[PDB]
Structure 1
């Protein structure tokens, strides 16, 4: 047997960032200045995004190594926060439209945007950790779902198939392909198992802004005309549900849970379209 439905816990104090680490412009403001930027980045931006991606990937790996029964989602946050700040990076989630921590921790039925808190991880849980780094004036965004102890076969299979769906989507990325192939591949694959692909939350262009206005759908919609072009940078971050798509948002305004409380899994990379294919920027 697995855990029953989650409830929100209490937050730890806001974690400090040394002043020499530049903040993204949106910290503490009600909105963010993003959504109207070009989608193909300059070479100088791309090189800085390889640095930001690798530091985010390090933070996600360190916190992922800590996922185990008995560890709280707040403890994960502490590890991601400390890794980012000790690398001179600002945690892009911290202060984004009031979000109060340095990564998102989404267990079980939480589709996305769970807030690290006093929740204790237990055996059987699946734990998504999503960390973004801001450094060099650019962002790098990556996430993965980690099993805690021995996870039930249907939950294990959902995690592993969601990882596969993400890899197959990444492997489609090539200049000249329609962006819509990403969702086509993910949804076709997911539907083989009777899973449902979340529609209202998507991937996104990323560069000097966190969500740059480019939207990357994870379901099939070939009416989107956008093509992949060298220099384009975006995330692929499918959330795939065992149950129905209907969801609710907790009173914190952030935590998104499945209404039927069936579990859901996600993985994410920041990608660069190169002249021949793809380069994963959030790579160790």
Structure 2
């Protein structure tokens, strides 16, 4: 048997960032300056995003390595935070529209945007950790769902098939392809198992800004005319649900949970469209 429905715990004090680390503009402001930037990056921007992406990948791997029964989500945040700052990177979530931590930790029925807190991870949980680094004036964004101890077959297959859906979408990235093929591949794969792909949350262009206005749908909608072009950088980050798509937000205003409390899994990479195919920027 698995755990029952989560409730919110208490947050640790705000984690400090040394002053020599440049803040993204939106830290300390109610909203962010983003959503109207070019989608294709310059070679110099792409080189800085390789750095940001590899640091984020490091933070995710170190926090992921710690996922185990007994560990709290706040403990995962401390590991991510420290990895980012010791690498000279600002954690993009920290202060983003007031978000109070340095990564999102979303267990079980939490679709996304779980706030690291006193919540204790337990056997059979699935723990998504989503972390973004801001360094060299650019962002790199990545996430993965990690099993804690032995997970029930249905939840283990949900995680594995979500990771496979994500890799299948990434391997469709190639200049000239409609961006829509990503959602077509993800949803067709998910529907084999009777899963539902979340529609209200999407992937996004990313560059000097965290969400540059480019939207990447994870469901099938071929009316979108956008084509993948060399130099474009965006995320693929499908959330796939065992149950229905209906959701609710906690009183904290951030934590997004499935209304029927059935579990959900997500993976995410920041990608570059190259002249021949794709490069994953959030790689170790």
Shift of 1:28: 1.4
Tell me which residue corresponds to 2:84.
84
Distance 2:4 2:71 in 1: 17
TM-score (norm 2): 1.00
Give SS of 1:49's match. Answer: helix
Gaps in structure 2 of 5+ consecutive residues = none
Tell me which residue corresponds to 2:120.
120
Please give the root-mean-square deviation of Cα atoms over the aligned residues, in Å. 0.2
Deviations along 1:56-100, whole A, 9 cap, x unmatched? 000000000000000000000000000000000000000000000
Shift of 1:234: 0.1
Shift of 1:8: 0.2
Distance 1:172 1:113 in 2: 27
Shift of 1:22: 0.1
Distance 1:85 1:112 in 2: 24
Distance 2:174 2:102 in 1: 32
Distance 2:146 2:42 in 1: 34
Distance 1:218 1:15 in 2: 33
- Count of residue pairs brought into register by the alignment: 284
Give SS of 2:4's match. Answer: coil
Distance 1:113 1:6 in 2: 14
Shift of 1:43: 0.4
Tell me which residue corresponds to 1:268.
268
Gaps in structure 1 of 5+ consecutive residues = none
Give SS of 1:111's match. Answer: strand
Distance 1:222 1:78 in 2: 41
Deviations along 1:97-132, whole A, 9 cap, x unmatched? 000000000000000000000000000000000000
Tell me which residue corresponds to 1:16.
16
Give SS of 2:141's match. Answer: strand
TM-score (norm 1): 1.00
Where has structure 1 moved over 3 Å in runs of 4 or more?
none
Distance 1:79 1:230 in 2: 35
Give SS of 2:96's match. Answer: coil
Shift of 1:46: 0.1
Deviations along 1:223-273, whole A, 9 cap, x unmatched? 000000000000000000000000000011110000000000000000000
